[PDB]
Symmetry: D2
């Protein structure tokens, strides 16, 4: 669903979705935003390797990694340690937000 939280990854073929928009870590290692069947943005790393994963890290940087765990693309927003979210929004932008400023503190474990 529409959010990737810091600490989580998208494995090969996993995605975020919002309405007709899909943001997917393809198995060809390209990361693409589709509007239905039209690609509207990508990391342009298709063919660079196979079975990459996407990580939303707690330093705030969003990074595509190869199966050997070498970076192949990153947003370059690596900064203070904290909690972040990457959001596929209702207006079609994909946006990284953080750190957390306030919380009810009602989470469960």
């Amino acid at each position: 669903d529409n959010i990737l939280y810091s600490g989580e990854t998208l494995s090969p073929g996993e995605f975020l979705n919002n309405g007709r928009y899909v943001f997917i870590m393809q198995e060809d290692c390209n990361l693409v935003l589709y509007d239905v069947d039209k690609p509207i943005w990508a990391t342009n790393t298709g063919g660079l390797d196979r079975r990459c994963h996407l990580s939303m890290q707690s330093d705030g940087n969003l990074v595509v990694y190869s199966p050997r765990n070498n970076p192949i693309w990153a947003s370059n927003t690596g900064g203070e340690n904290g909690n972040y979210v990457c959001v596929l929004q209702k207006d079609r932008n994909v946006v990284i937000y953080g750190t957390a400023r306030w919380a009810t503190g009602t989470n469960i474990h």
Copy 2:
């Protein structure tokens, strides 16, 4: 749905939802998080007035306002001008994040 963006409000009776969790600006001016029919957190401003609205502001502060536009509760996170989101998360926390650090820039208007 699970996000209130900076610049938007919840009017009386409007809500965020995620699974069995509901975060609603009640018409008695109380703002409450329910887990099904159990209230798990609230602003405890019920009865203070009627037909309040909730605003997620671009200074980053989340504020309950009376029909005359006087604040009656706030998160006290008012700070730099920017884009924020308030999120009802899958783990039951409600969290404010911002400002925006990175975007694909694919939004529409």
Copy 3:
């Protein structure tokens, strides 16, 4: 999410949701539709037993069963064998539909 398919069950504490509406198989064996924290319909079998499950069956009947697998409530719509769905709808009704009349035939396994 808002549909229970024939062949599936809700275990104790599992639910359907649509916006502020929740339809849950409670662990007290009562099956209840909530509008936020207000109960608007129930099977009224609370206390009859503990850790019941809900089954949407392929004969079309929706049935609450006790841990020993004895029926304690049913919709009485048991009829022809086929595919059905129970839907929590956007207008707040909960409705059983079937059998299947037409399909693209694009399902995966």
Copy 4:
């Protein structure tokens, strides 16, 4: 969202969605199911006309109509008058179900 109810239509460019699946009434009058950017089924009426609509009717038939209101494709499931749903399911099938067999009767107006 994933259901078209009897009595409703999809106008040009409107769609159903479920995860990475999208079922859209295109403005070229073709009705297509996409798995991300791959078309997996269609009515193959692209180019036949422009700005068609999709109707889920109360006789149970799902019909593509031209701007002049002449049928150009139909599921051929027109039958008894009642309530139906067309569902884009989690397993990638698109399925018509009806009529309604049972309801809580809690809808609002």
